[PDB]
Amino acid sequence: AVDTAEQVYISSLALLKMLKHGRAGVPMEVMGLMLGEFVDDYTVRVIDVFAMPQSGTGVSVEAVDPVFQAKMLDMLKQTGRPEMVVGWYHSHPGFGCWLSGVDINTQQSFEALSERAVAVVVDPIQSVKGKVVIDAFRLINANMMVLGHEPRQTTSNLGHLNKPSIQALIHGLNRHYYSITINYRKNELEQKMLLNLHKKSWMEGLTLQDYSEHCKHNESVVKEMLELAKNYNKAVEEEDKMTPEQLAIKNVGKQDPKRHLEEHVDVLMTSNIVQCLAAMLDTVVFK
C-alpha cells in the first residue's frame, strides 16, 4: 500500500512555471502537466511542467488535450527531456489547496493511465515572497473508505505536514483524497542567478544622486523633522501626565511624532552617509 512518507520534489523551474501560469490565468483554474519520474516507491521528482491551451472558459479543468499533450511530449523528447508525465497541476487563485469534483474526476482519469499520477494545486494569489502555497494530492478510494481501511501506510512520522487547513478539511481532505508532502531541489547553481536578481550594476552602485535634488530632499525632510519635533515636545509633555489610554488608544488615528521622527532621521542619515561615501570614493578613483 502507499506510504505516508511519499515526497514530491518540485524543481525550481517547475515551481516557477506553475507560479507563472497561476498569475497569468486568473481566476481560471489553469492547468498543465508535470513531467518527471517515479524514482522509487516514496519519491516523485517533478523535473518540469508545461501548460495546456486553456480553451475558452477555464473555471473548471478542461479535459486534457491529447494532441497538444502528445506534440509537447514528442518535441520535449526531441530537444531534451525523455521523461513521462508524473502528474497534472492546476491553479486555485485564492481558494486554497483543495480539489473540486472536476479535479477529482480528472485525477481518476490520470490514475487510470498511471496509478502514481499526482495532482498539484498551486495558489498564486495566496503565495507570498518566501512561502508558496502549493499542495500535492492523490485520491482516496471510496471502496476502501467504506470497507474500513486507511489508504495510507504509516511507516514514518512524516505525517505532520501543516495540521491540514480547515479549508481543505471541509472541501474533502482525508476523506476523498490525501495530501502528499512537497519538497524542493536545491542546486546552488540556479540559486546563483536567482540571487543575481535584484542585483544592480556598478553604474548604479557608484552613481551620485543629483545634488540639487539631494539638497531639496534634505531641506524638506528637515522641515518635517522640525514639525515632528514640535509635536514630539507636545506628546512627551502629555504622556506621563496620564496613562489610562496611553497604552493603546492614544496614538490610533493620530500621528506619532517619535515614530515619524525616527523614520525621517533614519532615511536622511542613510541618504547623506551614502552620498558622502560615494562622492569621496569617486573623487579618488576618478582622479
Binding site: 475558452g56 472558459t57 473555471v59 473548471s60
Partner: peptide, 29 residues
C-alpha cells in the same frame, strides 16, 4: 435514407454539444 438520417443526427449533435458547452459555464456577479 442513412444520408439524411445521419445528417439530422449530426445537426442535433452540434446542438447538444453547444448545449453542453453552455452547461459547463457559470454566471458572474
Amino acid at each position: 435514407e442513412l444520408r439524411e438520417q445521419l445528417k439530422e443526427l449530426t445537426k442535433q449533435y452540434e446542438k447538444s454539444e453547444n448545449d453542453l458547452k453552455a452547461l459547463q459555464s457559470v454566471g458572474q456577479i
